[PDB]
């Protein structure tokens, strides 16, 4: 039929693996709480501290939990989840990205919409003509015949308001990609060296022996 | 509608497994659990000392 | 009255014991509602003889 | 702007390395062993090995486990399974026709895609 | 390599993982907040109003 | 807000009414579909009834 | 321009109004910079013959 | 293989969703809700 | 003593932005999939990219078997079920002759 | 020493087969079956299933 | 590497921890205190030998009959 | 005269078994069966050898014909395929891409 | 005359403390039931596609097919 628009999703093991990540949070009980307390009180002082703190704590502990589940509890998704880029961008990076905009979104929004009224910032602005320029003309700068290109100006000014919120996104993406590359490449390199060693020893059974030890190599 | 084909139903036997290497088994991190279970159990249950008499 | 039970060897839950401290039970429940599990500087400001302790 | 905060000792770093060394010392305390029944094959020079004298500690901790010391060995027969199957496969006789018609993971097979 | 894939960039399965995870988080927040601090015990025990009386004589 | 809300909603409602009235008097495929729906027919039945005409008159069925 | 800097959300109003009116055309203009130089085919102007159908 | 360890083959099935049919039924539910409630045009519903 | 912790989840959610954070996260992830991943991957017209070895390596645990084509026969069974539920004529599509937008 | 005790233990095992069987029958009929008995019977059934496969 | 607050577990003040309950007059019940109730199987070992023999034999009998 | 639903001693004794867990008591006790019977050691080896086995079979013999044979000859061909794949004569005896 | 700042409990005073404890230890109880269920979900699982598979398991969510 014509009206039938069909979509195919690929579904796997999600429910029981996501339940235990949360059930473990009662065991960990936010052991990272003191570190993030210290850092948040280093970096900001406001009434809305606890909010951002809680966010980071949740995010961080989940990461930690997954990492340990990726190291120890090896089943299904827990192995891939740190080797996947979607987890590192959307499962760790997006929450940390939107956390300050969810805690201090009022102030940031007001700031951003005020910066669209672009103007030169003067320290100790005891000037009088500055006020008349800012009110009558809208800006300190000369805005004569900029309406002629307003179609671009608006959108450009929008970027001009968020340009100083953009490196946060860049750093989030960069460090997510960094963690993904680190995990993937190191796992692959280690496994590759192991496989080469097994090829050397399988063809020479004088060496196909627990030559370092059953627990020594594993412990190391 | 929903389906459950017979292609997924195949024979199974542990005899046909290739297996693992000594290196891959060491990378499975079982030898680490083997030690650190006892390590953490010892730390927890040895932190709490009982009363005693010095002889 | 609760300590009478504790002396008999009875185990009292952490929250069952708090109900026998009702004025602290209320302020503790509100601190939970606010969601700030931190502590220590409030004691050091209200009781400055504990500062640094 | 000019708050004049005194130094907080909790923000210092004078306990992490001591605590880690305390943990490592607790680990190494379980390496203490009696002279009776002691044997360790040294190197040909006569000098000790690295992993050798740090097996007693690991197995003294395995002694204290409850579940791993009876489970984590059940993946070890699989190692010998591979050791045996690899040698079986090193010299297995196969049909030339099937190997030329259906080579396993060979390149440039259009039925695979490349 | 397998994890190098655009299919795994916007994988709906991991999005379901995140969804279920944080819905369960939200469900269990009121149990994470259920830790007791002993600060109001201290305030009750140690806050002592001045109990001295006034005596003009 | 109440006068503004009523103005907005009523103007858009009357705009949609005008749109339907204009479609019904339109000698086209969409006019026929709108007419068939205003009778009180189901969407699927009206789609089939109009496509039976589209295949014959418009597309020139084999 | 003088309403933009007023208080009471008028900065948001001015920005959103400029967007809704002209910033959409600006987005289209930016999209069209890499289209002016490109070889495009003739526009298949509608013959305005398909769609007419007598009522019944 | 190492790449075999970097793979997630814990899939269970393919969920097939006719978004056209689902959209049609959603619109039908909206119409039924607005008719049963006898809601006017100025309503937020 | 009244607390939204024990008596109202709604007022607790409203009073804590760190409870809004996961919900916004969820909404944003689903919007990302809707805008970018939905039509490019999950639609039937865009589902064969999972057979690509470069952009979807070993999505079937192996290289895709094109002689077998599981996608084709799965989806064909499903389309056949649709056709039987709708009672559409298979050969009715072949009787169509579309015109051209002349001139 | 182990060989001597392995030999000497065979009469004990063959004698206590019947004893353990009778006690199990009595506990199952009487219903006086406890946790340790259940665990021992599960271990028994596991080994029996293994030896069933082996006999197959 | 890490501040002293994270190591000692508190930023300013060390909070008291509620001690563990004991339940006087009975054994502790924990994940590690279960061997008091469940020892290794020791009651039906000789019956295990007998049943293993009979299981092997009966399985071999019916399997051989089926195969033949 | 407690006005609340006083909980018996035995009920607390039983709940203490559930809430007196430590982190390692979960981590290691659940990681040992998991690491042994998981995607690393046993389940992974089994389920990933099966893929190569049936690839080899369907390429060389066919899945339908394989289904028609006996369980014994099925296992024989499966073992031959497992050996062919473990060897990896075409990859230079290396399980890498 | 009674003592001040004291009253009987009310419905909006919430549950007692023992009830909050009973609420807290429910995850800890379900842990023992869910971790074995996790291991069973992984161990009793079968892959969904092979090189020979002409079909793949499909799950019509809303029965539209
Ligand atoms: C001035 C205009 C500025 C508004 C800009 C805008 O985008 O508005 C359209 C925008 C959605 O438009 P659209 O998605 O482009 O058109 C398709 C419809 O949504 C089609 O959906 P619908 O009409 O059937 O649903 C209508 C209604 C029905 O709502 C209910 O049924 C109530 C329950 O409300 C909604 O569902 C909200 C819209 C749809 C969901 C949110 C937007 C989807 C974006 C793309 C997908 C994102 C995935 C989100 C996943 C969320 C987690 C599951 O509406 C809103 O989302 C908010 C409307 C608020 C109106 C308040 C007006 C009061 C003024 C005083
Ligand atoms: C041998 C591999 C382990 C040797 C050293 C480890 C060890 O024996 O620890 C005790 C270890 C576990 O301790 P347990 O609690 O006494 O286990 C109960 C026995 O499996 C319960 O079975 P059972 O050993 O008491 O008697 C079963 C009996 C059954 O006799 C038969 O009818 C089988 C006929 C086979 C031909 O088989 C025999 O005793 C000797 C015939 C050869 C087997 O038992 C064994 O593994 C030895 C028997 C295993 C035989 C099949 C292994 C596959
Ligand atoms: C839009 C209509 C504005 C009318 C106007 O007076 O326009 C006035 C503005 C100039 O105002 P300013 O002197 O304040 O900058 O004209 C322009 O900026 C260019 C608009 C394009 C005019 C066609 C060339
Ligand atoms: C409604 C689910 C219908 C169904 O049976 O579906 C059940 C399937 C499980 O079927 P399989 O185990 O066969 O894969 O799971 C789902 O579809 C749930 C998807 C969760 C993500 C959406 C939220
Ligand atoms: C609140 C009650 C809702 C209700 O009763 O809804 C009931 C209706 C009626 O369905 P039926 O009549 O076919 O049983 O459900 C629907 O029509 C579809 C709802 C959407 C379900 C899929 C969810 C994923 C979204 C993808 C579909 C396309 C978007 C549709 C808009 C959401
Ligand atoms: C399945 C039930 C596990 C049986 C474990 C037997 C036991 O009592 O347990 C005893 C064993 C330890 O035996 P040892 O004391 O002889 O070392 O394991 C434990 O101590 C705790 C096991 C926790 C896992 C429960 C499942
Ligand atoms: C030639 C064959 C290999 C060599 C000879 C046979 C192996 C001999 C070694 C001993 C037997 C090994 C068994 C191998 C089975 C296998 O393949 O293991 C893999 C299989 C799954 O493989 P498939 O999914 O492919 O069928 O899983 C199982 O067998 C299920 C075992 C259940 C284990 C539960 C252990 C619980 C321990 C208590 C912990 C309590 C803590 C809480 C957690 C709930
Ligand atoms: C070395 C190179 C540079 C990198 C340095 C950073 C490495 C960080 C990784 C090691 C992390 C160890 O993390 C360790 O977690 C435990 C949780 O049990 C914390 O433990 C802390 O919290 C617990 C409760 O949660 C308190 O009861 C305890 O008193 C306190 O020590 C440790 O303070 C921290 O040190
Ligand atoms: C301070 C040290 C500085 C030097 C750094 C050296 C790099 C160390 C990298 C550690 C990270 C490697 O990460 C680790 O990779 C190995 C190898 O694949 C994975 O190991 C897993 O896959 C391999 C691949 O064959 C299997 O054989 C193995 O049985 C399984 O456990 C581990 O699950 C993962 O945790
Ligand atoms: C649990 C995770 C998933 C949660 C998903 C919830 C998403 C909710 C947002 C729904 C968005 C509504 O967005 C709406 O989508 C439908 C398809 O469904 C589009 O509909 C479009 O495509 C459909 C079929 O594909 C056509 O039949 C229809 O005529 C056309 O308009 C609408 O134009 C759009 O407005
Ligand atoms: C070079 O690396 C130096 C980094 O130092 C890391 C320091 O962190 C040490 C963390 O290890 C622990 C773990 C537990 C504990 C205690 C004993 C306090 C745990 C507790 C609260 C259960 C008793 C102390 C230290
Ligand atoms: C959580 O942090 C704990 C991690 O600590 C791990 C430490 O691992 C190193 C232990 O390995 C050794 C090394 C040396 C030794 C002994 C060989 C100290 C030297 C000896 C016995 C000859 C004096 C024993 C064990
Ligand atoms: C006295 O009774 C003791 C337990 O007896 C239980 C009998 O259970 C019947 C099991 O049936 C089978 C038969 C064969 C198999 C196969 C061939 C699949 C097992 C295999 C692959 C390990 C050889 C599995 C189960
Ligand atoms: C170099 O370091 C290697 C050691 O790392 C081993 C990783 O172990 C994983 C988690 O192990 C635990 C387990 C329990 C704990 C404690 C005992 C502190 C848990 C607690 C806080 C509940 C008592 C800490 C770490």
PDB file of C-alpha atoms in Angstrom, chain M:
ATOM      1  CA  UNK M   1      -2.779  20.824  79.930  1.00  0.00           C
ATOM      2  CA  UNK M   2      -0.624  19.192  77.212  1.00  0.00           C
ATOM      3  CA  UNK M   3       2.909  19.977  76.116  1.00  0.00           C
ATOM      4  CA  UNK M   4       3.314  22.435  73.268  1.00  0.00           C
ATOM      5  CA  UNK M   5       4.634  21.833  69.749  1.00  0.00           C
ATOM      6  CA  UNK M   6       3.276  18.279  69.883  1.00  0.00           C
ATOM      7  CA  UNK M   7       0.332  16.800  68.021  1.00  0.00           C
ATOM      8  CA  UNK M   8      -1.005  13.512  66.664  1.00  0.00           C
ATOM      9  CA  UNK M   9       0.189  12.248  63.322  1.00  0.00           C
ATOM     10  CA  UNK M  10      -1.748  13.075  60.161  1.00  0.00           C
ATOM     11  CA  UNK M  11      -1.876  11.637  56.633  1.00  0.00           C
ATOM     12  CA  UNK M  12       0.318  14.410  55.226  1.00  0.00           C
ATOM     13  CA  UNK M  13       3.024  13.647  57.802  1.00  0.00           C
ATOM     14  CA  UNK M  14       4.047  10.814  55.482  1.00  0.00           C
ATOM     15  CA  UNK M  15       4.866   7.271  56.511  1.00  0.00           C
ATOM     16  CA  UNK M  16       6.746   6.369  59.655  1.00  0.00           C
ATOM     17  CA  UNK M  17      10.467   5.678  59.657  1.00  0.00           C
ATOM     18  CA  UNK M  18      10.216   1.887  59.692  1.00  0.00           C
ATOM     19  CA  UNK M  19       8.095   2.150  56.546  1.00  0.00           C
ATOM     20  CA  UNK M  20      10.766   4.284  54.880  1.00  0.00           C
ATOM     21  CA  UNK M  21      13.286   1.593  55.790  1.00  0.00           C
ATOM     22  CA  UNK M  22      11.007  -0.995  54.186  1.00  0.00           C
ATOM     23  CA  UNK M  23      10.966   1.215  51.091  1.00  0.00           C
ATOM     24  CA  UNK M  24      14.761   1.483  51.055  1.00  0.00           C
ATOM     25  CA  UNK M  25      15.592  -2.232  51.167  1.00  0.00           C
ATOM     26  CA  UNK M  26      13.363  -3.160  48.210  1.00  0.00           C
ATOM     27  CA  UNK M  27      16.098  -2.542  45.609  1.00  0.00           C
ATOM     28  CA  UNK M  28      18.497  -4.526  47.788  1.00  0.00           C
ATOM     29  CA  UNK M  29      15.998  -7.401  47.803  1.00  0.00           C
ATOM     30  CA  UNK M  30      15.316  -7.243  44.064  1.00  0.00           C
ATOM     31  CA  UNK M  31      19.090  -7.310  43.507  1.00  0.00           C
ATOM     32  CA  UNK M  32      19.191 -10.979  44.525  1.00  0.00           C
ATOM     33  CA  UNK M  33      16.395 -11.767  42.072  1.00  0.00           C
ATOM     34  CA  UNK M  34      17.667  -9.610  39.188  1.00  0.00           C
ATOM     35  CA  UNK M  35      21.376 -10.471  39.034  1.00  0.00           C
ATOM     36  CA  UNK M  36      20.589 -14.185  38.503  1.00  0.00           C
ATOM     37  CA  UNK M  37      17.990 -13.044  35.977  1.00  0.00           C
ATOM     38  CA  UNK M  38      20.689 -11.012  34.220  1.00  0.00           C
ATOM     39  CA  UNK M  39      22.998 -14.024  34.083  1.00  0.00           C
ATOM     40  CA  UNK M  40      20.131 -16.210  32.850  1.00  0.00           C
ATOM     41  CA  UNK M  41      19.198 -13.657  30.187  1.00  0.00           C
ATOM     42  CA  UNK M  42      22.766 -13.713  28.904  1.00  0.00           C
ATOM     43  CA  UNK M  43      23.398 -17.454  29.246  1.00  0.00           C
ATOM     44  CA  UNK M  44      20.071 -18.700  27.837  1.00  0.00           C
ATOM     45  CA  UNK M  45      20.413 -16.434  24.786  1.00  0.00           C
ATOM     46  CA  UNK M  46      20.829 -17.381  21.134  1.00  0.00           C
ATOM     47  CA  UNK M  47      22.160 -15.225  18.321  1.00  0.00           C
ATOM     48  CA  UNK M  48      19.593 -13.893  15.864  1.00  0.00           C
ATOM     49  CA  UNK M  49      21.434 -14.157  12.527  1.00  0.00           C
ATOM     50  CA  UNK M  50      23.900 -16.466  10.806  1.00  0.00           C
ATOM     51  CA  UNK M  51      25.544 -16.692   7.395  1.00  0.00           C
ATOM     52  CA  UNK M  52      22.881 -19.241   6.390  1.00  0.00           C
ATOM     53  CA  UNK M  53      19.877 -17.373   7.802  1.00  0.00           C
ATOM     54  CA  UNK M  54      17.236 -16.544   5.198  1.00  0.00           C
ATOM     55  CA  UNK M  55      15.063 -14.977   7.921  1.00  0.00           C
ATOM     56  CA  UNK M  56      15.650 -12.785  10.961  1.00  0.00           C
ATOM     57  CA  UNK M  57      13.343 -12.601  14.021  1.00  0.00           C
ATOM     58  CA  UNK M  58      10.815  -9.803  13.555  1.00  0.00           C
ATOM     59  CA  UNK M  59       8.620  -8.320  16.295  1.00  0.00           C
ATOM     60  CA  UNK M  60       5.558  -6.393  15.127  1.00  0.00           C
ATOM     61  CA  UNK M  61       5.087  -4.017  18.046  1.00  0.00           C
ATOM     62  CA  UNK M  62       1.560  -2.771  17.274  1.00  0.00           C
ATOM     63  CA  UNK M  63       0.276  -5.614  15.092  1.00  0.00           C
ATOM     64  CA  UNK M  64       0.063  -3.411  12.003  1.00  0.00           C
ATOM     65  CA  UNK M  65       1.422  -6.257   9.842  1.00  0.00           C
TER      66      UNK M  65
END
